Amino acid sequence: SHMEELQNKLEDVVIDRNLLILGRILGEGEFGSVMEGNLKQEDGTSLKVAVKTMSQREIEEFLSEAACMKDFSHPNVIRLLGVCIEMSSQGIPKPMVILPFMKYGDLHTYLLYSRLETGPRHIPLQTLLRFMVDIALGMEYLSNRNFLHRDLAARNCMLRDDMTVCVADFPVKWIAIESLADRVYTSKSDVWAFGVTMWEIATRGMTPYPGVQNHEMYDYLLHGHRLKQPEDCLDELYEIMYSCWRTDPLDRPTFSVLRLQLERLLESLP
Numbered sequence: 351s352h353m354e355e356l357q358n359k360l361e362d363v364v365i366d367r368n369l370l371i372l373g374r375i376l377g378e379g380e381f382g383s384v385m386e387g388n389l390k391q392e393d394g395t396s397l398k399v400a401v402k403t404m405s406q407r408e409i410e411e412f413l414s415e416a417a418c419m420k421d422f423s424h425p426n427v428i429r430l431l432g433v434c435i436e437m438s439s440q441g442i443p444k445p446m447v448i449l450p451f452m453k454y455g456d457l458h459t460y461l462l463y464s465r466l467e468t469g470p471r472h473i474p475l476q477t478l479l480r481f482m483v484d485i486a487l488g489m490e491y492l493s494n495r496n497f498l499h500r501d502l503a504a505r506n507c508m509l510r511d512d513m514t515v516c517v518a519d520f521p522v523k524w525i526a527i528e529s530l531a532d533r534v535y536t537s538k539s540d541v542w543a544f545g546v547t548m549w550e551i552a553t554r555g556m557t558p559y560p561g562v563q564n565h566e567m568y569d570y571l572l573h574g575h576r577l578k579q580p581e582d583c584l585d586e587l588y589e590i591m592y593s594c595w596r597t598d599p600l601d602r603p604t605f606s607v608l609r610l611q612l613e614r615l616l617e618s619l620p
């Protein structure tokens with residue numbers, strides 16, 4: 351059964367490389383690049399997509415990992431469309447991930463662009479808190495499938511045509527105190543990272559803990575200091591984000607609890 355489900359998921363996940371046309375490069379780096387593409391669909395029409403380029407063992411885990419994420423269906427979690435693996439001239443495998451195109455790019459850049467004239471308009475507080483709700487909803491879905499994100503941050507949240515946020519790509523300043531110390535990581539560690547992401551949103555893209563350096567962070571945290579309240583951040587919003595950084599991770603709210611707080615606060619806005 352367990353196996354049977356894995357076998358099916360595996361069936362679905364691969365896309366014939368001839369259904370796919372690559373385009374220009376949207377952002378090149380270390381692990382690799384993100385490029386625009388067209389995915390030929392079952393109905394005969396093409397779809398604009400994004401295309402991410404990243405041992406047979408690491409190949410097979412990539413494929414098994416891709417199969418599980420393809421099963422994820424929620425509007426605040428980025429849909430994996432499928433995978434291609436095209437071989438090089440030197441012979442190393444090149445594993446491509448296919449994603450729906452996110453017109454507005456990543457949330458962190460978008461927030462930064464918004465403080466420029468020619469960027470997106472100033473983002474009203476209501477919209478910012480809607481971004482938080484969307485992300486909490488995404489992470490609730492994940493925590494209910496017991497899946498850990500590991501790298502939640504504003505730069506890994508993506509903005510869709512319709513300004514829905516979805517979590518994606520699932521960084522000392524984002525890492526829970528317990529995980530710095532004992533390398534151990536629960537959903538409550540994702541909750542920590544969420545709390546930081548909320549702050550990145552509420553500051554419109556500031557790097558967490560100005561004036562503190564990465565190497566200083568465990569002690570800074572170990573002495574009870576946390577991120578400060580941003581100017582024009584509602585106290586209730588700050589309370590919600592501060593609960594994410596409680597020392598005991600058992601004392602932190604679940605995503606489901608956070609989401610419910612965030613939506614209530616949003617509803618109470620005029």
Ligand SMILES: CCc1nc(C(N)=O)c(Nc2ccc(N3CCC(N4CCN(C)CC4)CC3)c(OC)c2)nc1NC1CCOCC1
Pocket residue numbers: 376377384399400402428449450451452453454455456505508518519
């Ligand atoms: C989850 C991985 C990922 N998925 C997607 C996706 N599913 O579609 C994706 N798309 C994407 C779409 C559009 C853009 N644009 C480019 C033009 C720019 N212009 C510049 C010129 N300026 C005058 C006006 C603005 C505005 C942003 C984009 O920028 C990088 C990315 N990116 C992903 N990963 C990135 C990798 C780099 O780090 C951020 C996350």
Ligand SMILES: [Cl-]
Pocket residue numbers: 370371372
């Ligand atoms: Cl091509």
Ligand SMILES: [Cl-]
Pocket residue numbers: 425427428429450516
């Ligand atoms: Cl999506």
Ligand SMILES: [Cl-]
Pocket residue numbers: 554555556557
């Ligand atoms: Cl900044």
Ligand SMILES: [Cl-]
Pocket residue numbers: 558559560576577578
């Ligand atoms: Cl701070």
